[PDB]
Design a protein around this ligand. Structure first.
Ligand SMILES: Cc1cc2nc3c(=O)[nH]c(=O)nc-3n(C[C@H](O)[C@H](O)[C@H](O)COP(=O)(O)O)c2cc1C
Ligand code: SF4
Ligand code: SF4
Ligand code: SF4
Ligand code: SF4
Ligand code: SF4
Ligand code: FES
Ligand code: FES
Ligand SMILES: [K+]
Lengths: 72, 453, 112, 183, 111, 218
């Protein structure tokens, strides 16, 4: 939990223009970004040596009609 | 010690008023009454008088919770006169032998509490004393002391008697009020308190017959003399209905801090077998846990000294036993008593008191398991603190009393039954072959210990 | 929001012309004293005046031609439900929940 | 105390059996209400119930119906009172009532033996009625005679400090009418 | 198969548990108070072409009224014959009662 | 008039003289209850709503204890959760194993609160057995199975006060207390059947609706 919290903050500090917020649950770190911040944050997480996420496993969505932008 | 408060306890002074007055009855009364309810209550808070019901609350302070009655509106002062607890006989002796002493104290106490009327609730098992106490009531009415013109003063006092028809639960402070009003008699939740809101909507105060019967002395005799006996703040003289497995069960009137050994030699005979044969002691009453032998070595009768060792001086019904008896059956009988007497409205005591009863009956025969001994202890903790009236607390303390001090005896009982029966019994008493055939439990020892009847 | 978003949802035209939806908050049930199912707003569709349910002749089932009979939506704000209904161009009608009136309850009141 | 709380009409008991106070019991009943304030006269069910019990012999359903009528109460608030208290007999109960305390302070003086001694003579068990209707044995909880533990209670009397050889005096006498002196 | 007690009374008390577990919604139960007061079912269907043969109904039955017999050889010519109504399932419980006991005796403790 | 209090850190503003449970229910804290209904007089006998107040050793029946000013009320101490499981372990001591055959099956408060606030295991294997009661017949509309009553007196309080039908009450004492009418007579009120909704358990169920459906179907 701590190490993802540190590494989650590191990404936010590196890219304050894009990372709206980050969250940690057990052993899963989530980065929340706008649609216009997607290609930037994805590229950073792919190329930065400290975080080389070359492999994308899943692309999905979820419907929450109550929110203004339903799809997540 | 001289100057016993109740000397007619052996019936050698007379119950009629004429012999009552020469005994030390009404005198300086109007001067006491016309000293104000402020002087009487200020005496009592200084007195050190505390309730004889078992709570240990200051009797004098209790009276100061009542509101003043400028128009003398019908505020009642219920004079509790039930025994209830097994082994207690103090209340019977005061009513049956010294009736006018109680009636004197009620008026004096009622004067302090701005009251008008006083009800003396007496059990239905004291049927003859109910008629007898009413006979002593007639002698009180004729003297003109109780009525709309009390002793000629502008303050009045009225007395009525409300007989009960048999319920241990009615001995509560709130159950007592309900039974007068014609309800079943189940205790109420404390707010609003009877000091504020009680009988018929008017403020009321419940006091034991023993507590009221002592006020005539304390009011008339000095007032500072009271603090002399016992320890500090556990002050006053006290009746004791010593009984059980003893040489001579009898009643005394000793002070507080009386050591048990001195109390088991000076009077009340002694152990049936000697002090080395003592098994257990149930002071106060069946409510408190039964102390072991070693606790009694420096036991001093106090509202709190007995509390330090886990017991208490509730109704001073000090019980002394011997080692030629099975305490498991003796405690089991208390459990089957609180069950049969619990009013049955709160969930913890309506059901949990049956949970205890269904288990002590398996304990007394030893048909259980060794870990189940501490199972029932966890049950007794699930009852205390969850009930409205203190009967639930009084039904769990005896169960802890057996476990706290006599644990190896229950284990030996179970180990006997393993050898006696030959096959170890599982949880709940079920043998290996016990089952249900055509509507009945078969091939298992069924404990018909629910009084059969 | 303001857009006619239904033109991209591919839903049949009849949900716009021929069916009526309802935005409501589920009421508290008399049998149970829980108060949790009455905190989310829901959308349900009215039944059909014929063909909502009819008995299957062979096995006695409950046949139906209503494809919205088992569709209930959930929300957490009332506005989100209304906004979503507006977005799809639904002919809805809102059912305002009743509000229980406060009454203080005192133990002592049984005698006073 | 026999704990059944649902009343079944018998040939001996039903609301169709009339019950009316005697001329004397009216005078006591009129003055029993004198202890309770006018707006709370319903508190006198417990006195009147036992007062009416003695006129008839037990606490019949007609008594409860009559008592409720007297004090302007629905008959249920009397049924709640009647079955809560253990001294109301909702059955013929016979002539006498043996009450044998079996609690622990009494059981320390061999209170079992008194129970065996009574069961021997009358051929009955606790909670039973004799074939003659003269007696009806009945166990009981504490009565206060614990310091004088091994105590029997017949009707409303006291016989403390007893033995199985002390039971011979009383159980023989009551049939003959020679009632020993209580105390 | 729907089972019976040795006395002959149907085991199912129309409790509708199996209908609520059933992942495929293959069960249809309609119940009411019987003529003599018993809580019994008058309609009970399993859509054997909709069941996934999963055993949840069997696990959820509090009285072991609904079980799955070891039979597998019951292929039918028409699909109407695979809509087992209460008459059909009770006739299976009688037919396969002995074999159900074989399995219940063996695997009773493991459940 | 209003007295400001905090329940588990949530500020509460209610009318003075209200009980704790209404204050807690306004703050959103859920306090389990059986005997408390918001249209009936307060009885405090089911002992399930117990909370802890800061200046006391004694647990408070939040359905009866009136609200104070500045009082701190706790509801989630381990001491309280021990009490809730103790009380739950007592109601189910004598309750029958009737849930499959009980018309209250999917909508019974004794199920959902026991699931949520009680323990997941029972510690009652006693060989004497549970308490059994005879079902009382009180008309053609109310089907009684008194084995299941948890002695909560909602039926008594409703019929006496709201309905004005004083023939329903508690007859007996302690372990033999038996809600009913003592003698056999039908309940006579045009509002008598609302007791079917108040009775939280299957003790009082609809007779016309008996055995016909489960609440999740409707
Ligand atoms: C279950 C139960 C039974 C009680 N029985 C009696 C009794 O028989 N006599 C008595 O004086 N107090 C009895 N009490 C105590 C009363 O509640 C009351 O508070 C007590 O009499 C206080 O009076 P006091 O302070 O003047 O002594 C009983 C309490 C409980 C819970
Ligand atoms: S604790 Fe027991 S006896 Fe006391 S009021 Fe509650 S249910 Fe009645
Ligand atoms: S085995 Fe078949 S009928 Fe039973 S629950 Fe599973 S899918 Fe439903
Ligand atoms: S689970 Fe068993 S008892 Fe319940 S409805 Fe299904 S078959 Fe009947
Ligand atoms: S009342 Fe509730 S807990 Fe009791 S048998 Fe019915 S469903 Fe089960
Ligand atoms: S019958 Fe139902 S409503 Fe009445 S006390 Fe029992 S559980 Fe409560
Ligand atoms: S214990 Fe028997 S009279 Fe008190
Ligand atoms: S809800 Fe408070 S004790 Fe029942
Ligand atoms: K119900």
């Amino acid at each position: 939990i701590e190490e993802l919290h540190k590494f989650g903050r590191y990404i936010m500090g590196c890219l304050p223009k894009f990372v709206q917020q980050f969250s940690v649950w057990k052993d899963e770190l989530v980065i929340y970004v706008a649609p216009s911040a997607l290609t930037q944050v994805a590229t950073f997480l792919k190329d930065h040596t400290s975080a080389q996420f070359k492999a994308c496993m899943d692309v999905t969505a979820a419907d929450y009609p109550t929110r203004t932008n339903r799809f997540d | 010690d001289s100057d016993r408060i109740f000397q007619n306890v052996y019936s050698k002074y007379g119950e009629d008023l004429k012999s009552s007055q020469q005994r030390g009855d009404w005198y300086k009364t109007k001067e006491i009454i016309l000293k104000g309810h402020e002087w009487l209550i200020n005496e009592l808070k200084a007195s050190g008088l505390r309730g004889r019901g078992g709570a240990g609350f200051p009797s004098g302070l209790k009276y100061s919770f009542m509101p003043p009655n400028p128009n003398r509106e019908p505020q009642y002062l219920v004079v509790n006169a039930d025994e209830g607890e097994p082994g207690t006989c103090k209340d019977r002796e005061i009513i049956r032998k010294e009736p006018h002493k109680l009636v004197e104290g009620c008026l004096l106490a009622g004067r302090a509490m701005n009251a008008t009327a006083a009800y003396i609730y007496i059990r239905g098992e004291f049927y003859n004393e109910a008629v007898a106490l009413q006979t002593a009531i007639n002698e009180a009415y004729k003297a003109g002391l109780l009525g709309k013109n009390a002793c000629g003063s502008g303050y009045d006092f009225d007395v009525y008697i409300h007989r009960g028809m048999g319920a241990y639960i009615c001995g509560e402070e709130t159950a007592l009020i309900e039974s007068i009003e014609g309800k079943a008699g189940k205790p109420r939740l404390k707010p609003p308190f009877p000091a504020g809101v009680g009988l018929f909507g008017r403020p009321t105060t419940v006091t034991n017959v023993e507590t009221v019967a002592v006020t005539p002395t304390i009011f008339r005799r000095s007032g500072a003399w009271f603090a002399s006996f016992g320890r500090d703040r556990n002050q006053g003289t006290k009746l004791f209905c010593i009984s059980g497995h003893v040489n001579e069960p009898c009643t005394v009137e000793e002070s507080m801090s009386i050591p048990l050994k001195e109390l088991l030699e000076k009077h009340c005979g002694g152990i049936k077998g000697g002090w080395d044969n003592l098994l257990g002691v149930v002071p106060g009453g069946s409510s408190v846990p039964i102390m072991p032998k070693h606790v009694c070595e420096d036991v001093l009768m106090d509202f709190d000294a007995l509390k330090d060792v886990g017991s208490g001086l509730g109704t001073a019904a000090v019980i002394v036993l011997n080692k030629q008896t099975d305490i498991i059956r003796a405690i089991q009988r208390f459990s089957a008593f609180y069950k049969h007497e619990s009013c049955g409205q709160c969930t913890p005591c309506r059901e949990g008191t049956t949970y205890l009863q269904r288990m002590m009956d398996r304990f007394v025969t030893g048909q259980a398991k060794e870990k189940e001994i501490d199972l029932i202890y966890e049950l007794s903790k699930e009852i205390e603190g969850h009930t409205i009236c203190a009967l639930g607390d009084a039904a769990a303390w005896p169960v802890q009393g057996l476990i706290k001090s006599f644990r190896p005896e229950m284990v030996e009982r179970i180990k006997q039954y393993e050898a006696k029966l030959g096959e170890s019994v599982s949880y709940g008493g079920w043998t290996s072959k016990g089952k249900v055939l055509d509507g009945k439990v078969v091939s298992n020892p069924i404990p018909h210990d629910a009084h059969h009847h | 929001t303001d857009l006619a978003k239904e033109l991209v949802s591919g839903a049949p035209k009849e949900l716009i012309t021929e069916r009526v939806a309802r935005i409501y908050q589920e009421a508290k049930a008399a049998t149970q004293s829980g108060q949790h199912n009455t905190e989310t707003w829901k959308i349900d569709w009215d039944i059909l005046n014929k063909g909502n349910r009819w008995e299957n002749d062979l096995m006695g089932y409950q046949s139906s031609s209503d494809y919205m009979q088992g569709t209930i939506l959930k929300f957490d704000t009332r506005e989100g439900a209304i906004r979503f209904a507006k977005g799809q161009g639904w002919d809805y009608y809102i059912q305002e929940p009743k509000v229980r009136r406060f009454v203080k309850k005192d133990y002592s009141a049984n005698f006073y | 105390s026999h704990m059944i709380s649902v009343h079944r009409d018998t040939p001996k008991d039903n609301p169709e059996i009339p019950f009316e106070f005697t001329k004397e019991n009216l005078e006591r009943a009129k003055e029993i209400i004198a202890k309770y304030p006018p707006q709370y006269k319903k508190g006198a069910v417990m006195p009147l119930l036992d007062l009416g019990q003695r006129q008839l012999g037990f606490t019949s359903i007609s008594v409860m119906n009559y008592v409720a009528k007297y004090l302007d109460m629905p008959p249920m608030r009397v049924y709640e009172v009647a079955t809560f208290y253990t001294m109301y007999n909702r059955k013929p109960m016979g002539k006498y009532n043996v009450q044998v305390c079996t609690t622990t302070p009494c059981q320390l003086c061999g209170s079992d033996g008194i129970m065996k001694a009574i069961t021997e003579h009358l051929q009955i068990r606790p909670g039973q009625t004799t074939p003659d209707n003269l007696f009806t044995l009945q166990e009981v909880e504490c009565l206060g005679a614990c310091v004088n533990a091994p105590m029997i209670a017949v009707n409303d009397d006291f016989y403390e400090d007893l033995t199985p050889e002390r039971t011979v005096e009383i159980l023989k006498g009551f049939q003959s009418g020679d009632i020993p002196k209580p105390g | 198969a729907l089972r019976r007690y040795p006395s002959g009374e149907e085991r199912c008390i129309a409790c509708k548990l199996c209908e609520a577990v059933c992942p495929a919604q293959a069960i249809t139960i309609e119940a009411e108070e019987r003529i003599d007061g018993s809580r019994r079912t008058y309609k009970y269907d399993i859509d054997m072409t909709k069941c996934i043969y999963c055993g949840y109904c069997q696990e959820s039955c509090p009285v072991d009224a609904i079980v799955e017999t070891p039979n597998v050889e019951y292929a039918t010519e028409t699909r109407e014959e695979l809509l087992y109504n209460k008459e059909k399932l009770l006739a299976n419980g009688d037919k396969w009662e002995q074999e159900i006991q074989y399995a219940l005796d063996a695997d009773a403790p493991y459940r | 008039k209003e007295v400001e209090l905090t329940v588990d850190g949530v500020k509460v503003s209610i009318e003075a003289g209200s009980s704790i449970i209404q204050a807690a229910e306004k703050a959103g804290v859920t306090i389990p209850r059986y005997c408390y209904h918001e249209k009936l007089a307060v009885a405090g006998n089911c002992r399930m709503c117990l909370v802890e107040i800061e200046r006391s050793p004694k647990l408070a029946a939040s359905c009866a204890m009136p609200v104070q000013n500045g009082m701190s009320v706790l509801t989630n101490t381990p001491k309280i959760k021990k009490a809730r499981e103790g009380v739950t372990e007592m109601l189910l001591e004598n309750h029958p194993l009737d849930c499959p055959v009980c018309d209250q099956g999917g909508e019974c408060d004794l199920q959902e609160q026991s699931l949520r606030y009680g323990s997941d295991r029972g510690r009652f294997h006693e060989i004497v057995g549970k308490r059994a009661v005879e079902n009382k017949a009180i008309g053609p509309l109310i089907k009684t199975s008194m084995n299941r009553c948890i002695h909560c007196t909602r039926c008594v309080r409703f019929l006496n006060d709201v309905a004005g039908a004083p023939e329903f009450g508690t007859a007996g004492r302690g372990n033999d207390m038996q809600i009913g009418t003592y003698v056999e007579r039908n309940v006579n009120s045009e509002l008598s059947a609302n007791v079917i909704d108040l009775c939280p358990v299957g003790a009082l169920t609809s007779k016309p609706y008996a055995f016909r459906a489960r609440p999740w179907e409707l």
